[PDB]
């Protein structure tokens, strides 16, 4: 009896940015109008994103009462520290409570909780806090993930597979709660790597349940957790790296970082789908992160995926933009709405195994083997 | 076939720093020994913390070309940072390495690295550092816990067992790499518990190797890992706080700490062994985190536990002080040590269960039940 995942449940800020108008914002509430010739290398990072909207928390009313975030190096952490500590937890608490609601099941027989937040440090952590805010179990069995990044979707379902396998009748809840107020700051003319996750990264809370053995009369399964990998593409040391300096958190990603990663999705795929038996990768459904659309493009070219199988992938960066961990369990919560909408007979649009992937720092991939359930 | 513990190594910074000296060193460097009132308030939780040595990082040296860690609030987490994340790295590398020898498998056999650090937030964190530096398969399935603080020795043995039960053939690494240069720092008379992290917390490393189904030709059970179990003490929100902050990692604790815990204890103990028939204290080895002598003091007092039930544990926090989550581990290892010496028939002091006990932020209280081995 797999760990199945049994509820999805997303949340973003009420504040919306659309694309289009981005580089007009950004430029005039960081005070960099002057900057022409860096406008537009930005114009051209935000057009060629793929991203149409993107829910960010900082607001210009919160850049103007703090002028330490909208510059590009000051002392802003704590200004920052604040911000994220309390959004992650009420951003994470939307999500939980909707996950908690398709689940339905009362949240007194969630018996572990692991939380996933980018950045956010705080001791007692946001799985304390939202222990606290969900009025869970004081007993609830938590883990608490800072500073993973954008392959921890992978790492959290990891985790909570051992967990929901090993506990007869445990029932997880996932948070994973990302916030990027930490890592916002005004551009610079020396430097050109932390400018272009101003362009890509988006907020937002996603919560999922996992559990063993399914009480068919009231838990409904949306996706089984077969088998999860962890690795570490050959030959990227330093490529995705991420430093929570006294200015906040600082992203620094080589130009090789789409290569490595697509070069390396064979290998991981044929570790995971050989002892299944499996060498199409087109019969599989496909949720991947999307860290970039050059990531997406490179993953479609080098593995040989048709036009439709990150379809799903390339809507949540389109409406949502890199949600870091969370962005994964937006796509596997649209896939399985757009095939119940497309009138297909699983989760995962008509097929049978599916996988997850999770980038990040290391580079780290994460591959998690999926297999969709039967829809009437 | 439970999981269990194969083995346990140890590593502490070169820096021996002698309690009895502290005061004076502490005062000196920190420039501080104008105020006369703060240092007797120091001195005297250095005398009253039954700890005797701590290995630490930072020296003299360290606060002369960093001036801004040994101010009690001066900007300077930049700085912590680079010798935090090499340091955790380079400790927790010594005590794996000692946990790969005693274990007797080749480091390729193992399929899962838990890290655990205090602090060092990095990406990639200490789990990737410590895969390349071990040189460990790239494939080896990563947990990486930043920030869990006093508690975390309990959560990783939690983990390591649903790893190692789930997974056929599972050999998990933890290391628990504690540094406190990211709060090393000078003394508040407005903030006066904040010093408190500077007369107990020690550094160290500790590193275990667990598994389920032992290979009895090759591998040495120490102890097994009966059950698991995390909770939050009923009315002790804010009692035990640390923030990651401009000026590092920030220490608060309130004077209900040894009461909250202590007051809770029989509580944990109860819904750990009563499914097991087990309700005498006495008959346990203890394994309990050193937050305090008088946490220990207060634990002994109202579980009723015999006056040197807690030995190793004391034996511990004397020898190294406060080093977060690996120390656990380091009594742990010190148990099976001295009971062999004592020549004793198990790895828990002759006695069958025992207990684990991880204290911290929340207050959370990590519950592990344990199984000796004979010796
Ligand atoms: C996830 O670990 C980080 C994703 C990301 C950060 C910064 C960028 O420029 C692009 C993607
Ligand atoms: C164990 O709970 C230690 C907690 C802690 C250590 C250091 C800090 O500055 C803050 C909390």
Known sequence: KLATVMAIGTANPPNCYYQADFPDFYFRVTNSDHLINLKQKF???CENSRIEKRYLH?????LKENPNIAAYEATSLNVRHKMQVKGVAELGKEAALKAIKEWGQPKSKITH????CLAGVDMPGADYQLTKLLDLDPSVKRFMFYHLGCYAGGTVLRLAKDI?????????????SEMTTTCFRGPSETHLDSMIGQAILGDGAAAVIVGADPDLTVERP???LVSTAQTIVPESHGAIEGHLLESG?????????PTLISNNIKTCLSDAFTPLNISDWNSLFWIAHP???????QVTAKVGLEKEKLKVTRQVLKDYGNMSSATVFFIMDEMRKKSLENGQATTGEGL????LFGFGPGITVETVVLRSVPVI
């Open 222 to 224: 949306i996706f089984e």
């Open 249 to 257: 958190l600082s992203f620094h990603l080589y130009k090789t970082v």
């Open 113 to 116: 909780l692991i939380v996933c």
């Open 352 to 355: 049978e195994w599916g996988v």
């Open 164 to 176: 929901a396998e090993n506990n007869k009748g445990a029932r997880v809840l996932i948070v994973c």
């Open 43 to 45: 114009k051209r990072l």
């Open 291 to 297: 860290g970039g659309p050059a990531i997406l493009d």
């Open 58 to 62: 900082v607001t210009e009313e919160i």
